[PDB]
Design a protein around this ligand. Structure first.
Ligand code: CRS
Ligand code: CRS
Ligand code: CRS
Ligand code: CRS
Ligand code: CRS
Ligand code: CRS
Ligand code: CRS
Ligand code: CL
Ligand code: CL
Ligand code: ZN
Ligand code: ZN
Lengths: 21, 27, 29, 21, 26, 21, 29, 21, 21, 29, 29, 21
């Protein structure tokens, strides 16, 4: 999930865009 | 509690990044 | 509308707290 | 949608839970 | 908004009041 | 209270301090 | 401890939403 | 109080409600 | 200023980036 | 006024996110 | 680190309130 | 920097003021 991927190391804006509809 | 607090910050960032499209938050 | 835009920011924080494990789909009107 | 119901009026956490997955 | 303004006020009071804390009522 | 006083006009850090315990 | 300080700020924002009209009382031991 | 109980492990909204006036 | 440009009509992240150092 | 203050609160948050390592300089109008 | 990113998010929020009209310059090497 | 001085031990509003313009 986003917590397992983005709370262990910082996610770039590109990686965050993975969760957009 | 680290996961919970981090998730609170992640949803705020998804709101801005996703603009008009919105996003899906799931655990 | 900026007021609408900032209100949504507050809504997603609240949905995060209440939805817990269920999560949620945020879409914009 | 959620904006029309909760930005023009105060929505409790009970009312917001109807928008969860 | 008054409700969202209040959300910001509680965050500000948490910072300003330090160990004293505050009491919040609507 | 603080809402009538600080959401109608800006409150300085000192004015907010009035609402601490 | 900063971890406790930042968690506390997350707790007051949640209390604002959960307590609504009742309000709440926050004070640090 | 709420710090030792809700910062070491996740509190339900029902648990947080105990801290309401 | 950023307030004049973004406090009535929505500024995307792309417009906001113009205010970065 | 208060609406501009609330707006600013959200803008600094967004600048923190998009500006990354570069940072940003903020001053009230 | 994630903790540093989270801490900085809170710090910019705190500087926005404390600095008022003066404002601040936020940078993160 | 502010992260080094305030991200482990708490900085009071007074110490944070050192970082204003
Ligand atoms: C990795 C991460 C966590 C929290 C917020 C972010 O923007 C990024
Ligand atoms: C009505 C409303 C708006 C934003 C957040 C909330 O919890 C409730
Ligand atoms: C007057 C006011 C409103 C909201 C937040 C503040 O710090 C001050
Ligand atoms: C346990 C916990 C800490 C902080 C905020 C919450 O909603 C819950
Ligand atoms: C689900 C929910 C909403 C509001 C208050 C509570 O204690 C629980
Ligand atoms: C237009 C605007 C105002 C405030 C915050 C934002 O992210 C965008
Ligand atoms: C020490 C510290 C860290 C983050 C935010 C604060 O208000 C204070
Ligand atoms: Cl945090
Ligand atoms: Cl707002
Ligand atoms: Zn946080
Ligand atoms: Zn707001």
């Amino acid at each position: 999930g986003i917590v397992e991927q983005c709370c262990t190391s910082i996610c770039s804006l590109y990686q965050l865009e993975n969760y957009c509809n | 509690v680290n996961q919970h607090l981090c998730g609170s910050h992640l949803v705020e960032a998804l709101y801005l990044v996703c603009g008009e499209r919105g996003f899906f938050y799931t655990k």
